[PDB]
Structure formats: C-alpha cells, structure tokens
Amino acid sequence: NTASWFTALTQHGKEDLKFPRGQGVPINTNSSPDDQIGYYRRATRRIRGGDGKMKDLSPRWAFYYLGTGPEAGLPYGANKDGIIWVATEGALNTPKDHIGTRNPANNAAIVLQLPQGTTLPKGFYAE
Numbered sequence: 001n002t003a004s005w006f007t008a009l010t011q012h013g014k015e016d017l018k019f020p021r022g023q024g025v026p027i028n029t030n031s032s033p034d035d036q037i038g039y040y041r042r043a044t045r046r047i048r049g050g051d052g053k054m055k056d057l058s059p060r061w062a063f064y065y066l067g068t069g070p071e072a073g074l075p076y077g078a079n080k081d082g083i084i085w086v087a088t089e090g091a092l093n094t095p096k097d098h099i100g101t102r103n104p105a106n107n108a109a110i111v112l113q114l115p116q117g118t119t120l121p122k123g124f125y126a127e
Contacts (some may be wrong), residue, residue: 045087
C-alpha cells in the first residue's frame with residue numbers, strides 16, 4: 001500500500017484536469033529526462049457535512065509515474081475516467097518501476113511544483 005511521490009492538485013473548479021502536450025509533469029530532481037511521464041488520478045473524498053448529510057469534498061488529482069500506482073498496468077494514453085496523461089518532451093514510453101511509489105514511513109511527499117512557464121489549468125491549485 002503506497003502513496004503518490006507528490007502532494008495533490010485540488011480541483012476547486014468544475015472542469016476535469018488536463019494539461020497541454022509537454023506540460024504537467026511535477027518537478028523531481030531525483031528523476032531523469034527519460035522518467036518524465038505519467039498520469040494524474042482523481043480521488044473524491046466524501047465527508048459528513050454540516051447538515052448531517054454525506055457530501056463530496058473538492059476532488060484531488062495525484063500524479064503517478066507511468067507504470068507505477070493504482071493504474072500501473074495502464075499504457076500511456078489509455079482512456080479511463082478520472083485518469084489524465086502528461087509527458088515532458090523526450091520522456092521514454094516505458095514503465096518507471098525504478099522510481100515506483102512512495103512509502104510515507106520513510107519519505108515525505110515532494111511539494112508539487114511545475115516549471116516556470118507552466119500555469120495550472122483553470123480551477124486547479126497545489127495546496
């Protein structure tokens with residue numbers, strides 16, 4: 001049982017996450033140009049709201065390197081609801097088992113940061 005290497009993006013708006021081609025891979029100085037590829041997975045948590053009724057919190061979208069997390073078996077570009085793909089120019093379309101997922105017992109999450117020119121899509125924030 002593991003976690004994303006990075007903190008999540010919170011969807012405060014109403015649009016599903018998407019990044020233009022070449023953008024969206026979180027910065028990780030412990031990874032190489034070939035490794036810069038993966039997917040974000042949506043996770044919507046439910047909570048007992050103020051009025052006693054169950055309700056959805058804002059969705060979170062967590063990054064996983066290609067071939068590693070809850071959808072480790074998916075090839076790049078696979079169509080699946082709640083899954084969107086990202087790849088930096090020059091990345092290799094190969095699984096990243098050498099990066100894998102994070103064990104929270106011995107590694108903090110990396111704060112999700114994107115290169116300077118990239119801005120997060122509308123309604124998206126790295127909290």
